[PDB]
Amino acid sequence: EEMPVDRILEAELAVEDPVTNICQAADKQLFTLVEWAKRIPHFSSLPLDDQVILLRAGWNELLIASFSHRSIDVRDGILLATGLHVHRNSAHSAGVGAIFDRVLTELVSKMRDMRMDKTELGCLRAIILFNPDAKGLSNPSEVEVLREKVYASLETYCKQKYPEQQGRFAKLLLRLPALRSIGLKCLEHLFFFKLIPIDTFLMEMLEAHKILHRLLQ
């Protein structure tokens, strides 16, 4: 494959008060996320301004996807990269309970019940990353083509590792709309935190970009 799922799996493995703790874990992971993106096939071949754009457009859904999968074996909560847990009760006391439940229902639970493996996650995240609809892109077709290769690698993987599950490929993709809506709603909360104990890279990501550029060079 020109988008080999092995290389994508390598990239996921190569990276191993509620509201504050979430922002703090988010800042931490933004650093990691750049190293993750660099190890996805062809990402770094793209123009540098396009690499920036794609990460700016994707980071939020990308971090949510990964902390969701990371939380598969947790009960009624999520596991942050800081190592700290967040449980329903906290989330609700903090006025963040509605979106919290949606994450558990639409992602964590679904991932668990499917046994969504680490390759399949990787492919979904690479699909999210390579978003031709991100604004400002020099060559959007270039990015659409990369996205499409992930479609193809992924489906093949699914037919080969899970042949008895004919609906598996689609089951994975149909997580993406729910993710998008959930992501929009999380962005909202992050914007509110900003209008009221916040860190430096995260801050950069919420403004309308020097740390990001540095980091990719």
Binding site: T105, E148, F169, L184
Partner: protein
């Protein structure tokens, strides 16, 4: 690999359901406040008219959409509050699919009902903002590029309706269960229609993702309407948070 008889017939049912619904919506063409012609009078009332016109078109869409859902196998076998939760969330999305379906790349125009043709700028004259109008036409273009036929559209619309992650859905397990045969059918149909083009299916599913964003952009449009004191009719206010819908189902 192969298309079951039950599947063939369901797709037929869906395509039928659509066309029937468009012929009913054409009945309502002289019903609609005419689009003002000639130079606008000083009173300002040609704005108000354009906006009333567009709005009456949407209403007809909502009606068309409800009539369509009712004909989708399974939809009526759901609880009435779920029917509503589903049609509320998905109306704007389906509205946007239909819009794209009625787009013409050569005139860069959109045709509503039989022969009401509107450009980007007509959309602006009718009170919608560029932050909304542009995405609508970017979406139309992307959709045109895909070349969907009437069956692919009908299926994708049904799949859209049976999204279990909508707000206030009380029986989500049932909704995914309903959705799943429609996804299965679309897989088969597309794979028989165009076997050389294996990417058609996921490309299509990814439009469901796009529509979530556009829904959002449409909330931004509602924001700006209230900021400009443009007031939507009851049915649209009901459906976009700004009784009836229940009645439309009950008929």
């Amino acid at each position: 690999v192969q298309l079951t008889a039950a599947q063939e017939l369901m797709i037929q049912q869906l395509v039928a359901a659509q066309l029937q619904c468009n012929k009913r919506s054409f009945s309502d063409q002289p019903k609609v406040t005419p689009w003002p012609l000639g130079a606008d009078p000083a009173s300002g009332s040609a704005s108000q008219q354009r906006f009333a016109h567009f709005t009456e078109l949407a209403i007809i869409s909502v009606q068309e959409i409800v009539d369509f859902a009712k004909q989708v196998p399974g939809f009526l076998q759901l609880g009435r509050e779920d029917q509503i939760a589903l049609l509320k969330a998905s109306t704007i999305e389906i509205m946007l699919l239909e819009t794209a379906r009625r787009y013409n790349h050569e005139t860069e125009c959109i045709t509503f009902l039989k022969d009401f043709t509107y450009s980007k700028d007509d959309f602006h004259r009718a009170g919608l903002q560029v932050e909304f109008i542009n995405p609508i036409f970017e979406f139309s273009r992307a959709m045109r590029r895909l070349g969907l036929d009437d069956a692919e559209y009908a299926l994708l619309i049904a799949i859209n309706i049976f999204s279990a992650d909508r707000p206030n859905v009380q029986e989500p397990g049932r909704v995914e269960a309903l959705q799943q045969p429609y996804v299965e059918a679309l897989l088969s149909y597309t794979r028989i229609k165009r076997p050389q083009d294996q990417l058609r299916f996921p490309r299509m599913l990814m439009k469901l993702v796009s529509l979530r964003t556009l829904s959002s952009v449409h909330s931004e449009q509602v924001f700006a309407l209230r900021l400009q004191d443009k007031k939507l009719p009851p049915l649209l206010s009901e459906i976009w948070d700004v009784k009836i819908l229940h009645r439309l189902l009950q008929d």
